[PDB]
């Protein structure tokens, strides 16, 4: 009975590019981290067993990490407009996701949810094809995402790469 | 592995 998570979070800088962090969780224990202010901004193993992998690995997943910086930077400017907020604000945006795998290697539960400034914003229900929206400005996101089929895209990771890479990670001891 | 870039809001 096992579990996997990622928490990617940014916080806006008034006028510059924000501060981004991502951390991996395996069975509730942190095994990896990213940070944009370290002088060697990169993905780091935060646990012994993860040291095995060759760098091509680290550099790839690091390439992924930049994407979120311009993503977060963009969508913090989006949410700002929805709520009619001033530009000088310093806000925080969070992406939490992952899946829960059984003992037999099947999928039990998938997670995809977002939060704006610390309060829950939008979340993926357990039928995994429907969203629950928090506020009226979150019904827009849901509106766009549901008609255009957001879930199907996200199921790709959860059904595929999530369970595969969870297995690979657990292959120590 | 981290997921890629999600959808625009």
């Amino acid at each position: 009975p096992h579990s996997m998570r990622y928490y990617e979070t940014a916080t806006s800088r008034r006028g510059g590019e924000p501060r981004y962090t991502s951390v991996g969780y395996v069975d509730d224990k942190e095994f990896v981290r990213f940070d944009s202010d370290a002088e060697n901004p990169r993905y780091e193993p935060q646990v012994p067993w993860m040291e095995q992998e060759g760098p091509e690995y680290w550099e790839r997943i690091t390439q992924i990490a930049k994407g979120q910086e311009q993503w977060f930077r963009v969508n913090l400017r989006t949410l700002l407009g929805y709520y009619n907020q001033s530009a000088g604000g310093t806000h925080t945006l969070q992406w939490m996701y992952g899946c829960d795998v059984g003992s037999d290697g099947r999928l039990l539960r998938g997670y995809e949810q977002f939060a704006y400034d610390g309060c829950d914003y939008i979340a993926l229900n357990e039928d995994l094809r429907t969203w629950t929206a928090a506020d009226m400005a979150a019904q827009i996101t849901r509106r766009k995402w549901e008609q255009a089929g957001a879930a199907e895209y996200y199921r790709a990771y959860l059904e595929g790469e999530c369970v595969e890479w969870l297995h690979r990670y657990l292959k120590n001891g | 592995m981290p997921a890629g870039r999600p959808w625009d809001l």
Partner: T-cell receptor
Amino acid sequence: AQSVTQPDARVTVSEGASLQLRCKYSYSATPYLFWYVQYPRQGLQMLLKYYSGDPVVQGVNGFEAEFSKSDSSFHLRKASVHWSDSAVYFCAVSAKGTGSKLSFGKGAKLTVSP
Amino acid sequence: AVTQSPRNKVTVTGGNVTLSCRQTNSHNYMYWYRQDTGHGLRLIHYSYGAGNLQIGDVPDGYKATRTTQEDFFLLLELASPSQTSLYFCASSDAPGQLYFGEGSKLTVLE
């Protein structure tokens, strides 16, 4: 790295007749697959999309496509073809890390014989 | 609803031509394609958000500027007969789901 190949840039089909336009794409890893259509004197518009799940994605107007991971393809099918369907059909791909960068197929002109 | 301008423009080898695209929509992705017989649609440049610019597959002799989220321009400071084509703007809010302009047909003369 990423190519898209459409075999026949020329097809001619009687009404009602079955049709199969073909799209074979370049390898790996997790490709995102589409079919676009360009009307006479117009621009393109999305026809079908596939992200994950059931390999057969159906269109409301009778088009449907099937993605085969093994055969590595995204083929467009219609049981009965109508004259209004006379148009150009592009198939498109994009992968992880390149999610917003589409690679368009060659294009294929469809002549529905009246 | 994506609109691009000019719809038709004629120029000569060595000229300067600018194509405009406006999307009143809230799409943060904008695109520039060129359609040809014998080569289909090839991407030139694209952008993710106002001010961002990103490279396509055949950006040679092409430049682009994203002034706003809605405006996207294709800059041809130098004209050559190889760039004689039919050009399309696009916008997207979702991966791979695109809305196209009406096309700009260019004629570059020797």
